[PDB]
Design a protein around this ligand. Structure first.
Ligand code: HEM
Ligand code: HEM
Ligand code: HEM
Ligand code: HEM
Lengths: 260, 259, 259, 259
């Protein structure tokens, strides 16, 4: 409706916090809200990222950089957000730890969407979303479509850059594989910025998104460490496995031969 | 339930974003989600603040700093958050501005709840939320009850500090009035830190909260200026809100300490 | 040289901290370092800002946003920096306050420089730096040359924008004055972003710079309120500076855009 | 002295920046200023840290937390600051990379002091600082002394906590070794916060210092990846630094508490 609380639908949003602790624990609210605010930022992040792909498809560089600039800010919020949770100590967590289901952020569809959209494709990850065919659908679509990185590659191909013909038609279902034959394409760009400034721009943006995304990944792991700790794989050690993953290897590799 | 989505009620949460732009505008999502995350934090902030009042009533200091510590982290998110909204250019806002009603954050009951709870009480303000009598009642409660700051002077009083006897009971509905007799009480606290380290810790926690709150107030204002411009109420109203103060005595002593 | 400490000349830098408190005060290290770190960023800020103007003179757009982008990060550090100083309680400050002279950051050449570079000129300032003819000379250089904003207006003038002829040559030593005739120029750009995407990006970069600056300005004022106090000049001077603006036209158009 | 630039010694501080690129590369100023500001906070960090150790020795809890609170903010700035250096692309670095020397932060005497101070003791590290007997002597002093953590464990021993007698006296020159007998000491502190609130507070302050320091450690590595890429030593060396832990017992107890 026309009301502030009506437009934002606050009665719906503000009644979604249901602590399931009979006695009612003080620190459960934070646990819930810290999860919901993230889910909200992820939604927006997905909305802006999808626009990054369309803009690239359309050779609209200034538009894409814009949406990417917002994504970074959103991603940064996701990251910065862990600071509040860092206040949840083991003595507090202990109070409502039990009444928690076996669930985990691994079931985060939106998160998965992001991961897929950025290039970390994984077919076997479709079954974990069977309960909801609609969402599984939205996930399969992005899974079959080239990633942000791939659309960025097909973009460079449309403007003289020696992009391996394979990036014209392939099974996008399979996650991108580090392609060494992509190093010279990025050496040219990094050695002639004044000329390839557009591409240059998107490159650093891409590096920004991946980097900021790793910060989130890391801050995420550290928080878990101080809450439930390690125990050394699927768990705290697993979150350490994701840190090794990269969205745009080629981009980082070139850093080792650029200007040699 | 046991679901990740079921425990967080994501279907109910992720279906609250309802863009009213008939043609459907890209940047309108940011408008909504930006408001919603803030509200979710405002709700947590209240949760914590309320406990800050119960611990003070119980003389539970270390427990009180803990919640205020969290409150500060949250208040810091709220402030930092604007950075993402500062990316909403006037060109964009121009595309869904019209569909928006005359309503503004002035209707944020939760916000108003934080305002009163911190001391900035305003009786003739509970009218705007006449629509929701249930929430109105919850608002009138914190209004008629001692503020976070007032329940702090009570704490000082129980431990032998020269706190005016008027604080033991009065019209809580009326905002706090700068008290000159409070100056000597805090000058003492700050000159004998080791002796009054507890009251000295709580004092700075209060100065932090207010400062942070003012940061949010300022950032909010600046974001508005870069979206709808300045040039009465409107963005000018926000300007006045910055002159407000929660714990005047706390800031005043700063100029008398050790003089 | 080629050593770590030798390249960075750490011996010289690391010996620039000289607390003058005879009895020696623990918190005098923070007060000294809080300033020196900021003065180091300011230097970078000036180094990057001077390159922004040059790049703007040569129509080198992407380069300009590149240096400005860094300039925004630096400003963001300078701003977030106040956090560590907010931990300077009146009780601690009170201990080494007396050993400090009447001086103030008002004597910061780098700060004034930046202030001049952005357009906030003020000839009556060169006088406070009469002790340094070499540095003062630097101020005059930026005090007589077109400001960042002005160099941006001339930029627009070379690409067919109704930029008033009075900007091709004038007394740059005089602080810029709001011009209603610039309103239509920025409405066109803001209502046709695709077309004017370059000018559009540069406008938001400037709006970002001024905004981050205000935050730095504001945070500065608040930290002072909590250390010293509210005594126009003094703390009232810090409050007044907030009223200032580097690119008014840029913030005014926000009211008559897309209407 | 009484002058702003006098007291802060701005002529000394602002003349320590000497790029070695003959043609004078625009981006070398950042490279140099990025390090100097760090070394500035590091010097403060150590100052506050050393104050913590003493406080703990005298059983001055609220004083210890205070300095530790400032330490956190310094580390935070030291961590946040990586954003500005992230704006240096491989193209820019390339222009002055060649004239750079083989020196790395591994030569930072101050950083090392911090590392040792927190417990990461390393006898064979004194050698890399032999060129400076005055500084080496400073490191050897904090190397043979109990670290912040060790002094903390000595703190607990003074109040009924079952702390292994070995911490009463031993070779402090050797880095602390994970001890399973400490587990029950922290389980008792976390499962009885109302009783051991002081201990509880110091335990979380310590957990924050190490976490923030790990963040700084991680951003540092990430910024290195985008400047010089990845491809024992170098980048793979920064990856191992994250595997280190200052207070293992504090993190491992997280899995035994409440069970
Ligand atoms: C109380 C704080 C939290 C703790 C202790 C925690 C702990 C964990 C653990 C132990 C895992 C391991 C994966 C598995 O076995 O399923 C995990 C995964 C994950 N968590 Fe968290 N979590 C916390 C908060 C959050 C929040 C607020 C989000 C919001 C999105 C989140 C998102 C995720 C995601 C997406 C994964 C897996 C994705 C991947 O494979 O990279 N977690 N978490
Ligand atoms: C597109 C960005 C935004 C703009 C342009 C904006 C603008 C305004 C304006 C013009 C007012 C003045 C009151 C009136 O005449 O109705 C106002 C008040 C207010 N806004 Fe915002 N707003 C924005 C976002 C937000 C968000 C996300 C929140 C969430 C907390 C918020 C909370 C408030 C509050 C609480 C007040 C009134 C409080 C007081 O009485 O001091 N606003 N806003
Ligand atoms: C202990 C914390 C600080 C306090 C209490 C403080 C206080 C003040 C006060 C009272 C003024 C009024 C102006 C005057 O009469 O000269 C002022 C101005 C100023 N201070 Fe700070 N200051 C602090 C730290 C700093 C630092 C670290 C910088 C670093 C640049 C700084 C820079 C300035 C500048 C540039 C001005 C005046 C410029 C303008 O006119 O806008 N101050 N300060
Ligand atoms: C241009 C950005 C920077 C890059 C690419 C970079 C790169 C590196 C590399 C490759 C190493 C590994 C050791 C070696 O083989 O020499 C290293 C170590 C180190 N760097 Fe940086 N660095 C940068 C900036 C800084 C700054 C500003 C500081 C601040 C003091 C710093 C402090 C250190 C320290 C302390 C170590 C070693 C500590 C340990 O043993 O874990 N670096 N750096």
């Amino acid at each position: 409706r026309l009301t502030y609380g009506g437009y934002l639908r606050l009665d719906q949003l503000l009644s979604a916090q249901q602590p399931l602790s009979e006695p009612a624990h003080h620190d459960e609210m934070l646990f819930i809200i810290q999860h919901q605010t993230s889910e909200l930022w992820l939604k927006l992040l997905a909305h802006e990222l999808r626009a990054a792909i369309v803009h690239l498809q359309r050779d609209e560089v200034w538009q894409c950089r814009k949406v990417l600039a917002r994504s970074k800010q959103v991603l940064r919020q996701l990251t910065e957000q862990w600071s509040v949770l860092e206040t949840l100590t083991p003595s507090e967590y202990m109070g409502f730890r039990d009444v928690l289901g076996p669930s985990s952020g691994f079931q985060s569809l939106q998160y998965r969407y992001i991961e897929f959209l950025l290039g970390n494709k994984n077919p076997q990850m479709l079954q974990v979303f069977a309960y909801d065919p609609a969402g599984q659908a939205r996930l399969r679509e992005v899974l079959e479509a080239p990633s942000l990185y791939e659309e960025f590659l097909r973009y460079l191909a449309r403007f003289g850059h020696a992009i391996p013909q394979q990036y014209q038609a392939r099974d996008w279902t399979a996650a991108h594989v580090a392609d060494d034959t992509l190093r010279p394409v990025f050496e040219r760009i990094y050695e002639n910025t004044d000329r390839y400034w557009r591409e240059y721009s998107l490159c650093e943006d891409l590096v920004d998104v991946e980097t900021q995304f790793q910060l989130w990944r890391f801050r995420h792991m550290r928080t878990v460490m101080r809450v439930i700790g390690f125990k050394r794989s699927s768990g705290v050690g697993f979150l350490q496995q994701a840190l090794a993953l990269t969205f745009f290897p080629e981009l980082f590799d070139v850093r080792t031969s650029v200007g040699v």
